[PDB]
Design an enzyme around this catalytic site. Structure first.
Site, PDB file in Angstrom:
ATOM      1  N   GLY A 185      87.252  19.235  59.056  1.00  0.00           N
ATOM      2  CA  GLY A 185      87.612  20.033  57.878  1.00  0.00           C
ATOM      3  C   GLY A 185      88.764  19.342  57.196  1.00  0.00           C
ATOM      4  CG  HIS A 199      84.737  11.153  59.120  1.00  0.00           C
ATOM      5  ND1 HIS A 199      85.130  11.928  58.051  1.00  0.00           N
ATOM      6  CD2 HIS A 199      83.601  10.529  58.732  1.00  0.00           C
ATOM      7  CE1 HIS A 199      84.269  11.780  57.063  1.00  0.00           C
ATOM      8  NE2 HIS A 199      83.338  10.927  57.449  1.00  0.00           N
ATOM      9  CE1 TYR A 209      84.442   9.353  54.590  1.00  0.00           C
ATOM     10  CE2 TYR A 209      85.351  11.257  53.440  1.00  0.00           C
ATOM     11  CZ  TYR A 209      84.244  10.549  53.882  1.00  0.00           C
ATOM     12  OH  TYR A 209      82.959  11.000  53.603  1.00  0.00           O
TER      13      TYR A 209
HETATM   14  C1  LIG Z   1      82.803  17.269  59.959  1.00  0.00           C
HETATM   15  C2  LIG Z   1      83.606  17.535  58.679  1.00  0.00           C
HETATM   16  C3  LIG Z   1      84.567  16.749  58.220  1.00  0.00           C
HETATM   17  C4  LIG Z   1      84.975  15.618  58.842  1.00  0.00           C
HETATM   18  O1  LIG Z   1      84.230  14.684  59.145  1.00  0.00           O
HETATM   19  C5  LIG Z   1      86.445  15.536  59.227  1.00  0.00           C
HETATM   20  N1  LIG Z   1      86.828  14.392  59.737  1.00  0.00           N
HETATM   21  O2  LIG Z   1      87.222  16.453  58.999  1.00  0.00           O
HETATM   22  C6  LIG Z   1      85.044  17.280  57.059  1.00  0.00           C
HETATM   23  C7  LIG Z   1      86.013  16.944  56.152  1.00  0.00           C
HETATM   24  O3  LIG Z   1      86.757  15.795  56.353  1.00  0.00           O
HETATM   25  C8  LIG Z   1      87.080  14.920  55.230  1.00  0.00           C
HETATM   26  C9  LIG Z   1      88.611  14.804  55.004  1.00  0.00           C
HETATM   27  O4  LIG Z   1      89.353  15.687  55.494  1.00  0.00           O
HETATM   28  O5  LIG Z   1      89.017  13.800  54.367  1.00  0.00           O
HETATM   29  C10 LIG Z   1      86.276  17.756  55.038  1.00  0.00           C
HETATM   30  C11 LIG Z   1      85.535  18.903  54.856  1.00  0.00           C
HETATM   31  C12 LIG Z   1      84.565  19.206  55.804  1.00  0.00           C
HETATM   32  C13 LIG Z   1      84.338  18.415  56.862  1.00  0.00           C
HETATM   33  N2  LIG Z   1      83.453  18.574  57.853  1.00  0.00           N
HETATM   34  C14 LIG Z   1      82.457  19.741  57.933  1.00  0.00           C
HETATM   35  C15 LIG Z   1      81.426  19.601  56.959  1.00  0.00           C
HETATM   36  C16 LIG Z   1      80.939  18.333  56.585  1.00  0.00           C
HETATM   37  C17 LIG Z   1      79.934  18.208  55.622  1.00  0.00           C
HETATM   38  C18 LIG Z   1      79.387  19.330  55.019  1.00  0.00           C
HETATM   39  C19 LIG Z   1      79.849  20.593  55.371  1.00  0.00           C
HETATM   40 BR1  LIG Z   1      79.067  22.102  54.499  1.00  0.00          BR
HETATM   41  C20 LIG Z   1      80.864  20.732  56.333  1.00  0.00           C
HETATM   42 CA   LIG Z   2      89.674  16.341  58.759  1.00  0.00          CA
END
Ligand SMILES: Cc1c(C(=O)C(N)=O)c2c(OCC(=O)O)cccc2n1Cc1cccc(Br)c1
Ligand SMILES: [Ca+2]
Length: 123
Positions: A28, A46, A50
């Site tokens: 998240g 992850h 990014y």
């Molecule tokens: C697994 C994940 C994420 C990640 O891979 C992470 N590293 O936090 C993620 C996320 O991470 C991207 C970030 O914080 O830069 C943001 C929102 C939902 C996320 N989610 C959940 C998600 C991912 C894609 C669609 C939906 Br609907 C929900």
């Molecule tokens: Ca995250």
């Protein structure tokens, strides 16, 4: 723009992407403190992925990419190098989620952020 990632997560895990939203301390938006489990590490990695893409001039939160899933695995594609990089970060995360399906625990879904403690491990 989370559509393609959420799709990749569902294909690889057999779970709604929502099951990995607010999961643990890292899945998240944002994240801090010590990862609760292996799935949460995937998300820490992850986030790191990014960060590297942003430092490269990409915008992985927004990039739109293309991908498919055969028996050979996940194929990543896109017009730009940044789009393909975003897909690669996502792919490694989706594969990490699949691989750790064994220790996925429902108690860590929708984790109260107050319950996150410890140091923040570096990338
Ligand atoms: C697994 C994940 C994420 C990640 O891979 C992470 N590293 O936090 C993620 C996320 O991470 C991207 C970030 O914080 O830069 C943001 C929102 C939902 C996320 N989610 C959940 C998600 C991912 C894609 C669609 C939906 Br609907 C929900
Ligand atoms: Ca995250």
């Amino acid at each position: 723009n989370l559509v393609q990632f959420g799709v990749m997560i569902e294909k690889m895990t057999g779970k709604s992407a929502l099951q990995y939203n607010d999961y643990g301390c890292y899945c998240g938006i944002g994240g801090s403190h010590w990862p609760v489990d292996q799935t949460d590490w995937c998300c820490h990695a992850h986030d790191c992925c990014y960060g590297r893409l942003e430092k490269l001039g990409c915008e992985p939160k927004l990039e739109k990419y293309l991908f498919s899933v055969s028996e050979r695995g996940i194929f990543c594609a896109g017009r730009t190098t940044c789009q393909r990089l975003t897909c690669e970060c996502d792919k490694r995360a989706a594969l990490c989620f699949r691989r750790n399906l064994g220790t996925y625990n429902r108690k860590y879904a929708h984790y109260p952020n107050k319950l996150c403690t410890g140091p923040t491990p570096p990338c």
